[PDB]
Structures are given as C-alpha cells and as structure tokens.
Short mmCIF file of C-alpha atoms and ligand atoms in Angstrom, two decimals:
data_model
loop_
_atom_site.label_atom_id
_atom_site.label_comp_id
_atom_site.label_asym_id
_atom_site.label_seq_id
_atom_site.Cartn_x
_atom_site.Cartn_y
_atom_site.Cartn_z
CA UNK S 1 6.34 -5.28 -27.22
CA UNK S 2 4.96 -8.63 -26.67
CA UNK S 3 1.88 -8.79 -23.42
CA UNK S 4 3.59 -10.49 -20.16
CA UNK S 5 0.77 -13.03 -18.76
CA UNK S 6 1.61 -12.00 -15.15
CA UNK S 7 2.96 -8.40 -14.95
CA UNK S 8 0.69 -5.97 -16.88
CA UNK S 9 1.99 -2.08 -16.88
CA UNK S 10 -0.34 0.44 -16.60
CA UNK S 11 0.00 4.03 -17.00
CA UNK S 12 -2.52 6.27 -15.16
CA UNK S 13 -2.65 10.24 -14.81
CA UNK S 14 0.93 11.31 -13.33
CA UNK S 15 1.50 7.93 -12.01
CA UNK S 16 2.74 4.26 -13.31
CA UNK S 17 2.68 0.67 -11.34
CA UNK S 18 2.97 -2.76 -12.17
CA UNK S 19 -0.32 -4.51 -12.08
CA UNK S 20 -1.11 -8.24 -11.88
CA UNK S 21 -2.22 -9.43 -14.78
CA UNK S 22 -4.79 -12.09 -12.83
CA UNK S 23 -5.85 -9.47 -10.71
CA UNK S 24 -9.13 -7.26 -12.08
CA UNK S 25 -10.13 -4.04 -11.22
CA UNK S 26 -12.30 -3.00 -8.26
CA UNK S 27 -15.23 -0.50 -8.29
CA UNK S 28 -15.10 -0.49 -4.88
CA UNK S 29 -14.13 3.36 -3.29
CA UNK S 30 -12.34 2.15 -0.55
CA UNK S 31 -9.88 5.11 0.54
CA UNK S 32 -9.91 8.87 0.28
CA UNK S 33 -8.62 9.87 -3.34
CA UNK S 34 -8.81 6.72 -4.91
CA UNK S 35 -7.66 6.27 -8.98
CA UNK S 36 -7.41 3.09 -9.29
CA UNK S 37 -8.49 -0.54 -7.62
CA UNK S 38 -7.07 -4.16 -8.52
CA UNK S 39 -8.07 -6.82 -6.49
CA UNK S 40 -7.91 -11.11 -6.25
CA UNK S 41 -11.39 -11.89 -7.02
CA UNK S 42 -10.25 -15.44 -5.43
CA UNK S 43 -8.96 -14.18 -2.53
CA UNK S 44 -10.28 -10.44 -2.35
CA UNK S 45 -7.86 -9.36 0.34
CA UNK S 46 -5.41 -9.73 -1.72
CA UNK S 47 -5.71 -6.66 -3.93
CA UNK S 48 -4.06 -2.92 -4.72
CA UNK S 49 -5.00 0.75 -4.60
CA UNK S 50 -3.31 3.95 -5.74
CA UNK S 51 -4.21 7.28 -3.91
CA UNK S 52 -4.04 10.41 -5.12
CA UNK S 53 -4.64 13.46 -2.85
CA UNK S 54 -3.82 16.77 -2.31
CA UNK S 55 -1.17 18.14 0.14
CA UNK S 56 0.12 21.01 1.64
CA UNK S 57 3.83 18.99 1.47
CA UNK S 58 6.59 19.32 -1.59
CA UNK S 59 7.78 15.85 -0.35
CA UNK S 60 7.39 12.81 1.09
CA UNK S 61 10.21 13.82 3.51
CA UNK S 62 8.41 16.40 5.14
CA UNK S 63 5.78 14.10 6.86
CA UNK S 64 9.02 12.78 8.74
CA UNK S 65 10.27 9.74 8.70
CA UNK S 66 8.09 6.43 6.77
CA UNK S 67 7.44 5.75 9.75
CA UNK S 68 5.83 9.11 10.96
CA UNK S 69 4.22 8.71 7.71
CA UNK S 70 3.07 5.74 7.86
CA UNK S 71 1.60 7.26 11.59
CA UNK S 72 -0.19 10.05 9.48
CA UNK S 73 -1.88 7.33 7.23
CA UNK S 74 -2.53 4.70 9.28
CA UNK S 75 -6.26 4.86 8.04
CA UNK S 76 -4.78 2.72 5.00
CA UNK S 77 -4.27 0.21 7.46
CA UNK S 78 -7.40 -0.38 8.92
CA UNK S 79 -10.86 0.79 9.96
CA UNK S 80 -11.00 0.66 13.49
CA UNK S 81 -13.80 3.01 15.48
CA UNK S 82 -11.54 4.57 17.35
CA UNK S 83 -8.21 5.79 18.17
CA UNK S 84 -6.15 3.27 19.98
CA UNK S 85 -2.73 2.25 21.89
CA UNK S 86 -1.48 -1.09 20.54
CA UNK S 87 0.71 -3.55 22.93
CA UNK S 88 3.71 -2.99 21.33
CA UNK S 89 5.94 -0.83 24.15
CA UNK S 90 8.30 0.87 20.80
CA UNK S 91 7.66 1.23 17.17
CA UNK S 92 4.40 1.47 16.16
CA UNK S 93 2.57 1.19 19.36
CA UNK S 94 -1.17 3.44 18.08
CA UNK S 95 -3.25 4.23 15.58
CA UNK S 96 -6.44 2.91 13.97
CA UNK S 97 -5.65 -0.48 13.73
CA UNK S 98 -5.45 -3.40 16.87
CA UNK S 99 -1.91 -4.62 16.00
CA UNK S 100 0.75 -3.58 13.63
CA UNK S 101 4.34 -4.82 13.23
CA UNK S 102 6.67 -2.36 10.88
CA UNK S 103 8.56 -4.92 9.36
CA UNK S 104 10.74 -2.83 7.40
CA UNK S 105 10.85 0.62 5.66
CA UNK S 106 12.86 2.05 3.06
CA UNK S 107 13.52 5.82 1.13
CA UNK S 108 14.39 5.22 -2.13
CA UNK S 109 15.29 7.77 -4.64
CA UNK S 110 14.18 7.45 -7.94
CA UNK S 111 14.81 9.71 -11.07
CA UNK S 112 15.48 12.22 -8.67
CA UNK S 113 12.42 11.92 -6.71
CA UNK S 114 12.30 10.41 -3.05
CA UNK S 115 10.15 7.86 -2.37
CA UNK S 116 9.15 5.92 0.91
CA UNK S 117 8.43 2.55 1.35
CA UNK S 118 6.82 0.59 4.40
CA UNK S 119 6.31 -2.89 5.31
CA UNK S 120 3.74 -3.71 7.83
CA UNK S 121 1.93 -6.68 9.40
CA UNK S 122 -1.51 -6.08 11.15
CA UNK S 123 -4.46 -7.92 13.02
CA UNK S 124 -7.65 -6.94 14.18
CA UNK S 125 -10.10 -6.96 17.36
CA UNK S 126 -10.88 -10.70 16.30
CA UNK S 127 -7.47 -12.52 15.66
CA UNK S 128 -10.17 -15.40 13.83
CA UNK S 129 -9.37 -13.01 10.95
CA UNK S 130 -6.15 -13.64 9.58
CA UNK S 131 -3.28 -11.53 9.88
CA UNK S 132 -2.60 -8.95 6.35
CA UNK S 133 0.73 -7.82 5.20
CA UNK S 134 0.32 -4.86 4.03
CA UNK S 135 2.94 -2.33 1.77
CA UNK S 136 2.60 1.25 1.15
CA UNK S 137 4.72 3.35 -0.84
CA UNK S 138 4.75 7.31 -1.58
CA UNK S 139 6.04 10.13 -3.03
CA UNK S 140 4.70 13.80 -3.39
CA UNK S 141 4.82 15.88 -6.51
CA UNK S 142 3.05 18.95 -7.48
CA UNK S 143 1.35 19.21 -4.21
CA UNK S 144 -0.12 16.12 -4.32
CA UNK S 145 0.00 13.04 -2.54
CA UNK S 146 0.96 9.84 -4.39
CA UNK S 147 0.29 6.43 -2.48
CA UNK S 148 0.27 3.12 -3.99
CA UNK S 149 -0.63 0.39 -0.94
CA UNK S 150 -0.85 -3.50 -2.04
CA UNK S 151 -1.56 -6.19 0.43
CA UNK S 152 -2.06 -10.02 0.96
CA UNK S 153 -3.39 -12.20 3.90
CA UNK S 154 -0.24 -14.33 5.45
CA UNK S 155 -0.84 -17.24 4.32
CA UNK S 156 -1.60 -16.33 0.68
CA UNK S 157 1.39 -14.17 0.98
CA UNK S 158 3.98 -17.29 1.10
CA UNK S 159 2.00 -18.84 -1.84
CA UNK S 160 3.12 -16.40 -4.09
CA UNK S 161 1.20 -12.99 -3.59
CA UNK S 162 4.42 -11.70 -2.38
CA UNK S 163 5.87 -11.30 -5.28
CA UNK S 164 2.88 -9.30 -6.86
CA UNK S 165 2.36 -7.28 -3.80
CA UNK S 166 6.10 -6.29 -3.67
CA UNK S 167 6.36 -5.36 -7.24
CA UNK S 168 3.31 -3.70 -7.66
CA UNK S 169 4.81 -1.24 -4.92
CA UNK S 170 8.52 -1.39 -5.68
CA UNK S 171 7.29 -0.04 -9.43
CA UNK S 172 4.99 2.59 -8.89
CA UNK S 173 6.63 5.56 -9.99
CA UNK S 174 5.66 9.22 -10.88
CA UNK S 175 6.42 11.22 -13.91
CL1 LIG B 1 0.73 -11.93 9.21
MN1 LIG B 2 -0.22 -8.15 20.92
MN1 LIG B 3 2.21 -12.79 8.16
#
C-alpha cells in the first residue's frame, strides 16, 4: 500500500474518513465532542471536524428527517448570539445562523448502517464575509453520536475544495 499525495485515510476510535493530505490538523476545540480537526492553513475556512457525542438515540433516523437533524445541530453551522428566523418563507427558515440554503440531503445506507447527509450554504450578519458551503454527515451507533462536517468558502469551493470537502464526508464511516 503505496501513500496517495492527496487522499490520506485515517482511522480514529470507532470512526474512519478520508482526510486531505495538504490539510494539517487543528488544535483548535471548536465544537462540543470534538476528536479530530483538519484544516487549510492557506485558507483556514476551509477545514474538517469529526464529533463524537453521546445520545439518547439508536439512530440517526430518530432525530427525523436530515433535515430535522440538521435543525437539532444547527450550532455546527454557525455561532450566532441568538436564536433567529431567517428570510427564507420554507425549508430552513431558523436557527443560529443569518442565512442557510439546504442544497441537498441524502440517507445513505452503508454496511447496514444509515447514514445522513446534508448540503448547506450559509451567510452571516455581515454578507462582507463570504458565503461557506458547508456538509455534515451522521450516523449513531452505540449511543453515540457520530458527525463528520467539512466545509469551504464559495469561491475556494469551485477551485477545487469541493472535491476534498465532499469526500472527506461521503467516506466517513463507522465500524
Ligand atoms: Cl456560497
Ligand atoms: Mn436573504
Ligand atoms: Mn456558494
């Protein structure tokens, strides 16, 4: 097994994702139940996180539908001061962020497990801040909470980040 120069695999405690290789780990404790932290150091909102919390759950399907669950996280989208009804009139129209577009979910199954994935664009209270792109996705296992959530700004999104950020969340799996 030869090392790939732009995927790397990693293998953490119940969990696996692909990482990108150019990407570093972050000592930053960003999120409740943070394991692990990858981030762009040339573009630093471009970086990765995997959660791991506990639940009262035995799957992903019981917080709903992604997006209900994606309702019950929204904390991973932002850090707004206060609970808040966006413009949007259907989808998601609240939460803890200014703006967010679902773009598209999905609920894979994988080796038996069920898995959620979400697709989101947000802003914030200054829209001189770009706009993120931001994917989560989930499972639940032995009453805990899995989440892997990788994101990009826009515009380094259609210079490639895509890719990484899409992978990186399309491959996490749990044993
Ligand atoms: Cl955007
Ligand atoms: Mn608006
Ligand atoms: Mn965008």
């Amino acid at each position: 097994p030869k090392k790939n120069t732009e995927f790397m695999p990693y293998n953490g405690d119940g969990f696996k994702l692909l990482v990108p290789s150019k990407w570093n780990p972050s000592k930053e404790k960003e999120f409740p139940g943070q394991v692990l932290r990858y981030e762009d150091n040339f573009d630093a909102t471009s970086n990765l996180s995997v959660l791991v919390q506990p639940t009262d759950k035995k799957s992903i399907t019981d917080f709903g539908s992604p997006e209900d669950f994606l309702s019950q996280v929204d904390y991973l989208l932002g850090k707004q001061a206060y609970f808040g009804k966006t413009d949007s009139e259907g989808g998601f129209d609240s939460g803890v962020v200014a703006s967010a577009n679902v773009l598209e979910s999905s609920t894979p199954v994988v080796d038996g497990k069920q898995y959620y994935s979400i697709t989101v664009l947000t802003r914030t209270a200054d829209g001189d801040e770009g706009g993120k792109h931001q994917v989560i996705a989930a499972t639940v296992k032995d009453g805990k909470l899995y989440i892997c959530k990788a994101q990009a700004g826009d515009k380094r999104w259609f210079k490639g980040a895509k890719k990484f950020v899409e992978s990186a969340t399309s491959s996490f799996s749990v044993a």
